[PDB]
Design a protein around this ligand. Structure first.
Ligand SMILES: [Mg+2]
Ligand SMILES: [Mg+2]
Ligand SMILES: [Mg+2]
Ligand SMILES: [Mg+2]
Ligand SMILES: [Mg+2]
Ligand SMILES: [Mg+2]
Ligand SMILES: [Mg+2]
Ligand SMILES: [Mg+2]
Ligand SMILES: [Mg+2]
Ligand SMILES: [Mg+2]
Ligand SMILES: [Mg+2]
Ligand SMILES: [Mg+2]
Ligand SMILES: [Mg+2]
Ligand SMILES: [Mg+2]
Ligand SMILES: [Mg+2]
Ligand SMILES: [Mg+2]
Ligand SMILES: [Mg+2]
Ligand SMILES: [Mg+2]
Ligand SMILES: [Mg+2]
Ligand SMILES: [Mg+2]
Ligand SMILES: [Mg+2]
Ligand SMILES: [Mg+2]
Ligand SMILES: [Mg+2]
Ligand SMILES: [Mg+2]
Ligand SMILES: [Mg+2]
Ligand SMILES: [Mg+2]
Ligand SMILES: [Mg+2]
Ligand SMILES: [Mg+2]
Ligand SMILES: [Mg+2]
Ligand SMILES: [Mg+2]
Ligand SMILES: [Mg+2]
Ligand SMILES: [Mg+2]
Ligand SMILES: [Mg+2]
Ligand SMILES: [Mg+2]
Ligand SMILES: [Mg+2]
Ligand SMILES: [Mg+2]
Ligand SMILES: [Mg+2]
Ligand SMILES: [Mg+2]
Ligand SMILES: [Mg+2]
Ligand SMILES: [Mg+2]
Ligand SMILES: [Mg+2]
Ligand SMILES: [Mg+2]
Ligand SMILES: [Mg+2]
Ligand SMILES: [Mg+2]
Ligand SMILES: [Mg+2]
Ligand SMILES: [Mg+2]
Ligand SMILES: [Mg+2]
Ligand SMILES: [Mg+2]
Lengths: 149, 141, 129
RNA sequence: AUCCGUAACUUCGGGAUAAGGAUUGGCUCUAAGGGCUGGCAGCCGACUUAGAACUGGUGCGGACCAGGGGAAUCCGACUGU
RNA sequence: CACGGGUGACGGGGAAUCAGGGUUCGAUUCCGGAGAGGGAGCCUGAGAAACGGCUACCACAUCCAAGGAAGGCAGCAGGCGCGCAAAUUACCCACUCCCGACCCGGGGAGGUAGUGACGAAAAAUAACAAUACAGGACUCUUUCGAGGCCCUGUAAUUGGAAUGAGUCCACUUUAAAUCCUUUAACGAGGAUCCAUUGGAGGGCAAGUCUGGUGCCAGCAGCCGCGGUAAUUCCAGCUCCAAUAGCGUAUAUUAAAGUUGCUGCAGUUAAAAAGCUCGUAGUUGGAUCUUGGGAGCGGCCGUCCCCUGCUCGGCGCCGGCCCGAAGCGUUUACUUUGAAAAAAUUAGAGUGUUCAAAGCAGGCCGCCUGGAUACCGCAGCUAGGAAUAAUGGAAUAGGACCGCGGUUCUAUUUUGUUGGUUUUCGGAACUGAGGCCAUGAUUAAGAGGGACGGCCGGGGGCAUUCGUAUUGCGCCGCUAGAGGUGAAAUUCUUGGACCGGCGCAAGACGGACCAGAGCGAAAGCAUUUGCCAAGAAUGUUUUCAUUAAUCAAGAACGAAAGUCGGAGGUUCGAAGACGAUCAGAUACCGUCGUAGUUCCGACCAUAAACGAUGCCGACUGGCGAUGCGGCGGCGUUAUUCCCAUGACCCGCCGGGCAGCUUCCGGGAAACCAAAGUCUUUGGGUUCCGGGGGGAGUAUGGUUGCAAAGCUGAAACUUAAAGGAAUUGA
RNA sequence: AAGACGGUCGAACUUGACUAUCUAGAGGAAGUAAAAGUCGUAACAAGGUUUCCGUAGGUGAACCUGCGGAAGGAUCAUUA
RNA sequence: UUAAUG
């Protein structure tokens, strides 16, 4: 079951049993890390970094080839953002829906969806407060949320 | 139970404590409204002064004239249509006499053919109506 | 969501015993489930099982006989002393001749008879007979 | 004037200084509320507020200034003419 | 769940009902607290805010010469009142102790008697023999009948044999008595020395007996009985239940699986908030220690070992063994031990003649007992680490084995007196190293997010189209047109209705339209454009438990209704008229206001329904449909082929569904969930406890109002209701 | 020793406020229980206008009507 | 079309 939806969808990735690196992949772990450094220096979310790596370079799992995962490597070098990417996209979606309501106040369905997005933002906000990657004095304020894209 | 957690004791106890008040016997026993409405006031017997004798018509199919007494209590002053149990025992009860009044066994409820009578008469002027019916004792005159 | 994995697996094998399957696939593999299956094995209600170990929550395939009448579960994990275990086996087992109530102890997961042998109470797992 | 406290009703804004109480004099103190110069030091200027003691034949907003109040009914909303 | 309120609440050990769980009570002899009519204050004294101590005020009350004095029985007896409700104005310090100057005195504490059917234990009201009879195991007899080695009962038939209950001398008992036990003498055949309390239709054991009454009296806790043949009233006889006890009234427990932790239900009997978010509360995926060795018995069972770092002797040749002390994440959980007042409960022993009881007692001075178990919850302690929490090291301010400097310093030491600086050790700060296998479990058919192609009467804004309507203008011909079961109210030579061409504004979005789709629900259907969102699928993406249900709170919420503006074509509450009817203030027809249409604010109510809360797992198939993805003979379009649309056959995820049967359930109708329920426990909210009164009163809160939320009691009733069968 | 000023504890009296229980009351408006009462027939069969829910108006009265739902309806169905 | 009551 979904969180804020009655759907019961079963569609996600099925990682294989074998954690070993394949024979054809001659790309070393340092070369994979330098490609991750180049993509993060160009400016790209780690999800899209992993997508571009499994499309173009033919490396499916960074965790299987290298030692660490992608946002962990960005944290180890210093390319990670201030707040995580799922919270970032939820804040961006909330700003978009709030601008939509400001243009059209009558949209009660988008108002309900805005309340749902706010609830998911506050759930991830208290979760990252408990995990201590965000400061405890951080607070989602919709008047100041728009400047963060 | 519905909530089967390991530490739901206050939830189960508060839910049962709320739902006991919807029982008929529990609420009648634990509120003072029924005890205030009871003319005995949590008593099994009560003495009272006869003031008049009433012929009460009966209910549906059974059709008769029951014999009751307008008893005014001493401990409260309330008025009770007390019932004269046995045959021919209304003549033993005279006006302005102290009679003992008890229940009828349905715990404050009208019983059978008689509408609106909950209580009955046991003794008449410190002489029991059972002995007056059997013929053992005599009315003191 | 999935709260009690052990209760889900035992209700699955109970439905499999009621329908009459020779073997059933229960989907998660927990240590409590594996020790429960070995406790049923040492008394002989079920056959010899196996687990399928991926690097995830593994699976379990249990060969089933027809000796298992009902496999039950007691949720949550109530504490059971040696004084109260007689009342537990009175009101949960069908007889004092057969039937077993397994409960986890300090020595390990073991049934009520071995709990009486080793003199150790503990939290209840379920029942099987 | 200061300290309490303030009801029915209501258009929740009011009623309301509602209603009902206590104190108020003089004298002698204490505490708090600040500037200029070189968490400290020096030099100065202001009226208030709070508290205590003593005392006068219980007298003290001692003259003057200065709302009687409460519960209801009818009419007009009101301010105004 | 503070604070406030109520208690017909002193608290506890404990009492009753009890399967296991609980529920109710506890003023009451033991422990602790409070008080002496209501408060307040004090002397004395170690100890009092004491009241059989004082000092004031209030209530009550005594004497008086009118100035004044004196009181505190919720102590023992007793009196009044209050009551449904409760004892003698007795004897004694002899038992138990208490106090005093104490072996001596005092004790209404206490002991013993008087009342006592609160209650508990034991327990008389007869038994035997002989006659008549009525029968049963034998013998005999076809049955009828008969003999008694064996019987069993009945009958105001007879007979002695035995005893109390009472009477009563005498001991004994006791401070003196009373009662019990003992004991002479009396004392029993209708052993009149007479056992009652309720009932006899069913529940519930026990007369279709007799007489009277005739829906009257009355019986009846429930159903019911009595209306002139009463198995139910009133009397007699008989029988039944208990037996010195029984009935009645009230509180309470089991019954009640009708409060449901064990262990109730929520489609139709009473029931799931209209739906969604959501904090407390509750529940939370998998994963970190396997095994090996020695000894015994017949591959199995069982016991032992697999922690680390100051003080002394089986002691031995700086090292080894053993014992003692101290520190080694924290709990929840389990076991033992201590500390847990007695009285009570279970229970050892013991012939109070038995028993309830008591702690006694038994042997020819002695022998002995007066145990033990339990004592919830919390606190202490020592074993265990399976289960549930809890952390380590991730800007490496991390452990480990060592080093070099700065400051301070217990002091051993220079034969004994003093300073300074070092060797050597302890505390703090600080620099260069060596090493960890150096350190981050997996990515849940959990969830969140990114991305790809979709998909959809989902939502909002703007635009556009379609007809029909009603009204107007013009033209043509007309006496009818509307409307009804039938007529009329209505229009109509002032041209109604109809046909044709235009104009008008407001609606509505047919047929396509389906047991099809989307949306949390309410709901959503002309075309195009813009904006934000969403399910499912695809994924060898990312985060790594971030999750589920949710008091308080919050968003949306049909239609109707309310407040403002706009517009009002049709329909149409109210209202008017014509029909029908005995009557219509209704159904029918003609008009017709609010409303129905748009925008901005309220209202938060529906048969808001699937009368079925949400998430998760499992147990049968069949043909489909919708979306997305994948595979495979072949037709049809682009046309000139690859590759994409339309078809055909399959596979998978869930989305609304349907059909089928002994899964299984339910009272059945029926349901693949309403199943996995007495073989009862996956997690979490709301809600029901017979029917009315009543969703009513009152209190609070919201709203402009209508009304919305919460929400009783008194009183009344023995039924109300659900499913299914057969008649009508 | 008596007595006096002051302080403290503070009984008690009066006034005012709050809160709890009981109760009088003209008149109004409900429920329950009889009945050999009056008027109509709302509902149960398509109860003769199918029934019921929500929301408004009106009428002696059950009730009637408007708008939106539901079948607990008399339809599980109506054809290219 | 009308058709209410016991
Ligand atoms: Mg949720
Ligand atoms: Mg006023
Ligand atoms: Mg007036
Ligand atoms: Mg004026
Ligand atoms: Mg009290
Ligand atoms: Mg009390
Ligand atoms: Mg007590
Ligand atoms: Mg005292
Ligand atoms: Mg007294
Ligand atoms: Mg005193
Ligand atoms: Mg006294
Ligand atoms: Mg005393
Ligand atoms: Mg008595
Ligand atoms: Mg003595
Ligand atoms: Mg003496
Ligand atoms: Mg005494
Ligand atoms: Mg006798
Ligand atoms: Mg009789
Ligand atoms: Mg009977
Ligand atoms: Mg019988
Ligand atoms: Mg009878
Ligand atoms: Mg009970
Ligand atoms: Mg029971
Ligand atoms: Mg029930
Ligand atoms: Mg219902
Ligand atoms: Mg619902
Ligand atoms: Mg776990
Ligand atoms: Mg004890
Ligand atoms: Mg159309
Ligand atoms: Mg709520
Ligand atoms: Mg509306
Ligand atoms: Mg409207
Ligand atoms: Mg309007
Ligand atoms: Mg019309
Ligand atoms: Mg008319
Ligand atoms: Mg009409
Ligand atoms: Mg509702
Ligand atoms: Mg409902
Ligand atoms: Mg159950
Ligand atoms: Mg009820
Ligand atoms: Mg009856
Ligand atoms: Mg119903
Ligand atoms: Mg019809
Ligand atoms: Mg009718
Ligand atoms: Mg009709
Ligand atoms: Mg009808
Ligand atoms: Mg109907
Ligand atoms: Mg009308």
């Amino acid at each position: 079951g979904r969180m804020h939806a009655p759907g019961k969808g079963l569609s996600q990735s099925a990682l294989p049993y074998r954690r070993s690196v394949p024979t054809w992949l001659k790309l070393t772990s340092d070369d994979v890390k330098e490609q991750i450094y180049k993509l993060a220096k160009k400016g790209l979310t780690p999800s899209q970094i992993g997508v571009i790596l499994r499309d173009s370079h033919g490396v499916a799992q960074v965790r299987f080839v290298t030692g660490n995962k992608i946002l962990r490597i960005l944290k180890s070098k210093g390319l990670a953002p201030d707040l995580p990417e799922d919270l970032y996209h939820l804040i961006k979606k909330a700003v978009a829906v709030r601008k939509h309501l400001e243009r059209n106040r009558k949209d009660k369905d988008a108002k309900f969806r805005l309340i749902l997005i706010e609830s998911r933002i506050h759930r991830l906000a208290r979760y990252y407060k408990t995990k201590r990657v965000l400061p405890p004095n951080w607070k989602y304020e919709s008047s100041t949320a728009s400047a963060l894209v | 139970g519905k909530c089967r957690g390991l530490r739901t004791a206050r939830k189960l106890r508060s839910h049962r404590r709320d739902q006991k008040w919807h029982d008929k016997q529990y609420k009648k026993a634990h509120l003072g409204t029924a005890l205030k409405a009871n003319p005995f006031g949590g008593a099994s017997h009560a003495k009272g002064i006869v003031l008049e004798k009433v012929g009460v018509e009966a209910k549906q199919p059974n059709s008769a004239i029951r014999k009751c007494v307008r008893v005014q209590l001493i401990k409260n002053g309330k008025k009770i249509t007390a019932f004269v149990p046995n045959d021919g025992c209304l003549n033993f009860i005279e006006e302005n006499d102290e009679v003992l009044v008890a229940g009828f066994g349905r715990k404050g409820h009208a019983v059978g053919d008689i509408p609106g009578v909950r209580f009955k008469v046991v003794k008449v002027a410190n002489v029991s109506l059972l002995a007056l019916y059997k013929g053992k004792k005599e009315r003191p005159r | 969501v999935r709260m009690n994995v052990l209760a889900d697996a035992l209700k699955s094998i109970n439905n499999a015993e009621k329908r009459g399957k020779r073997q059933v696939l229960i989907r998660p593999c927990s240590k409590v489930i594996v020790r429960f299956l070995t406790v049923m094995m040492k008394h002989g209600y079920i056959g010899e099982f196996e687990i399928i170990d991926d690097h995830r929550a593994g699976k379990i395939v249990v060969n089933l006989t027809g000796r298992l009448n009902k496999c039950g579960v007691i949720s949550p994990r109530f504490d059971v002393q040696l004084k109260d275990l007689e009342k537990w086996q009175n009101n949960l087992l069908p007889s004092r001749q057969f039937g077993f109530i397994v409960l986890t102890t300090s020595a390990g997961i073991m049934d009520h008879e071995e709990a009486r042998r080793k003199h150790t109470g503990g939290k209840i797992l379920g029942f099987f007979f």
